[PDB]
Design a protein around this ligand. Structure first.
Ligand SMILES: NC(=O)c1ccc[n+]([C@@H]2O[C@H](COP(=O)([O-])OP(=O)(O)OC[C@H]3O[C@@H](n4cnc5c(N)ncnc54)[C@H](OP(=O)(O)O)[C@@H]3O)[C@@H](O)[C@H]2O)c1
Ligand SMILES: NC(=O)c1ccc[n+]([C@@H]2O[C@H](COP(=O)([O-])OP(=O)(O)OC[C@H]3O[C@@H](n4cnc5c(N)ncnc54)[C@H](OP(=O)(O)O)[C@@H]3O)[C@@H](O)[C@H]2O)c1
Ligand SMILES: NC(=O)c1ccc[n+]([C@@H]2O[C@H](COP(=O)([O-])OP(=O)(O)OC[C@H]3O[C@@H](n4cnc5c(N)ncnc54)[C@H](OP(=O)(O)O)[C@@H]3O)[C@@H](O)[C@H]2O)c1
Ligand SMILES: NC(=O)c1ccc[n+]([C@@H]2O[C@H](COP(=O)([O-])OP(=O)(O)OC[C@H]3O[C@@H](n4cnc5c(N)ncnc54)[C@H](OP(=O)(O)O)[C@@H]3O)[C@@H](O)[C@H]2O)c1
Lengths: 249, 249, 249, 249
């Protein structure tokens, strides 16, 4: 198929966008490795995906986990063709009530972990490999009480610009998918643990999208799969925004 | 079989990016209509493409030609699923030597014709159709003696932002592919008609690209096909830039 | 003080932002020339402002008007230090109801006239002169039924990027002020001719602004004066957006 | 004396842009507090600046220093009208050779310290106060071996977008000055410690600027003073780029 003969890694691939992307990449022929912190959900995801998908329990914020994750790839597949640095998250905190670890937590996972996931992956990635960073429209817009999340995603987008030049000798292109609001557990949890709070939040966020609906995670995965394929061969350092129009308007 | 059962129109599909795009769309199963001003080159492209591609001689800057083009589609295919407003061009003119004709010619084909191609197409386009405008990194960068071309391409990008909202009810999404330097007769012709000049310019423009090469026209076409397919269902008003890094760096 | 001795031209300086800007430039010591199509409103603006402001009846869309205007400046003041290509406007037209005259009128005044205002100005402008284009947040956002106006303002913004390079040897910098919603006759007229309609539209546009009010034209004038001053000596090709948060959030 | 009666704080005001800005703010009537880690350079800056400038030795990355800094302001001046988060820096590190310490150092001073400088200042800032974050064109461009610095500055720009909304009720506006290459010790040090190497780098970076020169730190300062004044009353969440054209082309 389109991505057949390609080895893809998705950090945080047991839920939400990571899971849908792993599903889509596998359905295009890739051998897929997914990661996640919780063993139970990791195993359930790997079973649901079938298709020679492979799981590793690993935390992207722990340098040693990253090392172990990639040695597993060197020993098994021997190379990495596609890298989707999906693992990320965010919470609400207005200016005036931002705690030091609200900052550290967001930036360690959303930014620092991306830098080192990419850096440790490089020895496994051949000429023509494709790296997809996970950004967000939050990186180029303003949302009340999400400055730190926004700042973290803008940092992600900027890294890809400079990495064009750092990876040019290596022949590896780096692009960013920036989703708008996507129906995931992640997003819903911003509504709290109440079903009504999640439902209310999800319905409010759908009303902000010009086309008036949230994305299904499979609609984000399609963008990643395109960037993973050789069809994106002349795209480098670019931000592809799939937001139903929200940030372009 | 991605665009199977889809009717696609490419204005200016007899050379360069339009031709490659028509080939690629068609290689996905699409029924393709191409246009062009010169009958010979049009006939020549239609024969080379085979595949139930159909040609119409029409100038996008002529209102009556547009009317005739779309009557032809109404009479034959009966609908339009994919629209690529590819017809466009540009020439060099520094500020201080910009003629009124230089301005009118650029903006009439690159901007005005796009507005009226889209508007005349609308009665043929069902819920879920996809429009692709042809932009350029020139629209978001500065290039000496190309102000008028740049301004025109920036205007094209802005149109899609508002058209998200104008076409929300009709369920039609509008996106922009913004190529960097793609080898094409158009591009080469900026060097003049001599072999020395075309080769020099083409090699100069390749040295500006971080990955160090011009785009093959097919590399742009793959983006349009992605935008044309249902994979792009949550992309609206977005600019997808395929420039090898040049405008992102 | 800051503009003491400087000769400034404001096209379309008989109302709104142009008028307020002419006032502010004069209050900073500049000799200001304002223009307008209507003699009565021109005469009243010149009289109301006093402060050594001078009026010329001229249409920016008429080449011969542009020539006579600049001949007036050569014979009277002998040079031009500051150019504010303010004269502009817009009207509503959804995609599906855009007339050729709606397109031509918008782009002739908003884009073409800017190009040729600047080009005819260049022989009067010394090293270190300052050009200010009037853009708009509509150029980087989407607004239902204002696609053509938006497109024209995006084109203005792009022009400045290329003109940095066209004007480098002449030492003339070019920047763009992009106002958000500003309380002018221009803006009110979008509400119709009834006072009720103007109040409704104006309060609606104010609710779109993060800080919750429209700009007074003097607040846009301050930005132009800053760009006109020598303080902007390291600003070139830039867009300064004064919108109360609306396009930045 | 646009800033007469206004209390301004400039973090990292003993050299370069911070020092020039403190000088310019002071020259407009402001009571200026500057900070710095080194006592000798701080003392020298206060003596050279005179004009009712006040110095405090404090590290923006140490929470306790910030607390002491702002208590001194509460006890002495009793309010803060203008905040310039200037203290910042960066060094080169290509992808493949980025250390955890290089990442932490850049992001702790350039981003984290900015967040908490702003947050601790807020109780001292009245309605109508003005915050200026110090960005960089690096935040929106690609530079080989400067991915981490670039990422940090894009994060800074992003922070202001959301802080528009967080600070609405408070009536405090937040904008970003983004310098291009500006002749500071900071920039020079990127050439190393030898005079030859610093001179070489400074001339190379001057050749990257369209207008062919580095900025004097006073040229950046004028932008900050403008944002600090009431002239910027309708500017909020905006990025003012003073780059001689480099990131606009
Ligand atoms: N959903 C949206 O609307 C949206 C919009 C824009 C951007 N994004 C971005 O898209 C990405 C995915 O978001 P999502 O909504 O799909 O999130 P999600 O459903 O909440 O979680 C996705 C996955 O991330 C894993 N994960 C979390 N922290 C991890 C860590 N430190 N190491 C490894 N795996 C980790 C989770 O498994 P464990 O918890 O077991 O580790 C889970 O499998 C994030 O970068 C997010 O910021 C989302
Ligand atoms: N090539 C690049 O590097 C590059 C980069 C960015 C953007 N673009 C844009 O991509 C588009 C295609 O460029 P290209 O380089 O492929 O151009 P091209 O090879 O020079 O010509 C493209 C096609 O446009 C047709 N055409 C021209 N004027 C027309 C008109 N008035 N009505 C109908 N058809 C017309 C031409 O046929 P006839 O002459 O027979 O009419 C030809 O088939 C243009 O919008 C261009 O600005 C190109
Ligand atoms: N107001 C806003 O919220 C806003 C926002 C963003 C951008 N802008 C831009 O700012 C500029 C001023 O807008 P405004 O609201 O102040 O407009 P306005 O109140 O309608 O005043 C515009 C001025 O332009 C003059 N003018 C119009 N067409 C002209 C022509 N062809 N030649 C010479 N002078 C001409 C008009 O005088 P005559 O009619 O007598 O010729 C009048 O003095 C425009 O470019 C507009 O697009 C405005
Ligand atoms: N120069 C450029 O071309 C350029 C371009 C874009 C952006 N910028 C940004 O502009 C700002 C100023 O840069 P610059 O070139 O003027 O820098 P600089 O000359 O290298 O130093 C600026 C000042 O920052 C102080 N400082 C450094 N670390 C500090 C800390 N942790 N806490 C408090 N004060 C601290 C220094 O004093 P001590 O060492 O004594 O603490 C010094 O007085 C930075 O944010 C920089 O990233 C500069």
């Amino acid at each position: 198929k389109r991505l057949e003969g390609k080895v893809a890694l998705v950090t945080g691939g047991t839920s939400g966008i990571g899971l849908a992307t792993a599903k889509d990449l596998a359905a295009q022929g890739a051998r897929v490795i997914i990661t996640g912190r919780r063993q139970a959900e990791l195993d359930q995801a790997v079973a649901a995906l079938g298709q020679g998908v492979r799981g590793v329990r690993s935390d992207v914020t722990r340098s040693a986990d990253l090392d172990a994750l990639f040695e597993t790839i060197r020993a098994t597949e021997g190379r990495l063709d596609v890298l989707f640095t999906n693992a990320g998250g965010g919470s609400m905190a207005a200016l005036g009530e931002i705690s030091e670890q609200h900052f550290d937590d967001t930036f360690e996972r959303n930014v620092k972990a991306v830098v080192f996931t990419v850096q440790k992956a490089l020895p496994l990635m051949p000429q023509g490999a494709s790296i997809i960073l996970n950004g967000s429209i939050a990186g180029s817009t303003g949302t009340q009480a999400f400055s730190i999340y926004g700042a973290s995603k803008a940092a992600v987008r900027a890294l890809a610009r400079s990495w064009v030049l750092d990876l040019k000798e290596r022949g590896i292109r780096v692009n960013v998918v920036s989703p708008g609001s996507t129906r995931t557990i992640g997003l819903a949890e911003l509504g709290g643990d109440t079903q009504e709070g999640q439902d209310g939040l999800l319905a409010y966020l759908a009303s902000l999208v010009p086309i008036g609906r949230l994305a299904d995670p499979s609609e984000i995965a399609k963008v990643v799969s395109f960037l993973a394929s050789d069809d994106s061969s002349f795209i480098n350092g670019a931000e592809i925004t799939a937001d139903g129009g929200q940030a372009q308007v």
